[PDB]
Amino acid sequence: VNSFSGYLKLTDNVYIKNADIVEEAKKVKPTVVVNAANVYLKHGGGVAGALNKATNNAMQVESDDYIATNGPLKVGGSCVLSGHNLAKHCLHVVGPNVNKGEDIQLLKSAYENFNQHEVLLAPLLSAGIFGADPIHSLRVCVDTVRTNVYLAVFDKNLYDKLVSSFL
């Protein structure tokens, strides 16, 4: 049993809910929250900007030190950093950004990072301001992630379309 509430079950391991990812993390304090990161860990807008704002910019300060030491992530890659006030850990995952021309086949590689964690609270990778089709992102998630993933979908309209169209 875990603390996640109000989710619709899609598969053995994937759950979905219409919710503000920063409000869900604050309520649950999950072991892992996933950030929709870029390779520079520059959290200016979208999921990253909202999560970072909720940490009072401490996520960005920690991320700048990580990049100064290690250099940029790979598209499809990840790193584990603090979850600050939101979670124990934040898994920063880089899905391909269609609005930069990145290979959508890298979305499966991005979701494979989730398999290193038994339970996660996450957004749909490469959705929102990243430019991919969220229906596609949900299919890759279900076909790639084997650990238990609780997906938070920001838009009520999109949530209802993801559920209604789910095979």
How many Å apart are CA 134 and CA 126, to the nearest integer? 8
Given a contact cutoff of 8 angstroms between Cβ atoms, the answer to whether 81 and 63 are in contact is yes
The count of C-alpha atoms lying within 13 angstroms of the C-alpha of 121, restricted to the half-sphere facing its C-beta, is: 31
Total number of residues shown for the chain: 167
Cα dihedral sign for 128, 130, 131, 134?
negative
User: Domain residues for 86?
Assistant: 1-167
Domain count for the chain, please give it.
1
Given a contact cutoff of 8 angstroms between Cβ atoms, the answer to whether 34 and 114 are in contact is yes
- Whose tokens are 């759950």? That residue is 15
Tokens describing residue 147: 């650990």
- Whose tokens are 């950093």? That residue is 81
How many Å apart are CA 160 and CA 72, to the nearest integer? 36
Residue 105 DSSP SS3: coil
Residue 93 DSSP SS3: strand
DSSP 113: G
Please report how the helices 46-54 and 21-28 are oriented relative to each other, as an axis angle in degrees rounded to 10.
40
Helices (H), 15-129: 21-28, 46-54, 58-70, 106-112
How many Å apart are CA 139 and CA 162, to the nearest integer? 10
- Whose tokens are 């700048």? That residue is 64
What is the DSSP pairing of strand 148-153 with strand 14-18?
A: parallel
Sequence-distant (≥ 6) Cβ neighbours of residue 88 within 8 angstroms: 29, 30, 31, 32
Q: Which of 102, 162, 101, 167 is nearest to 137 (CA)?
A: 162
How many Å apart are CA 55 and CA 159, to the nearest integer? 26
Neighbours of 115 (CB within 10 A): 13
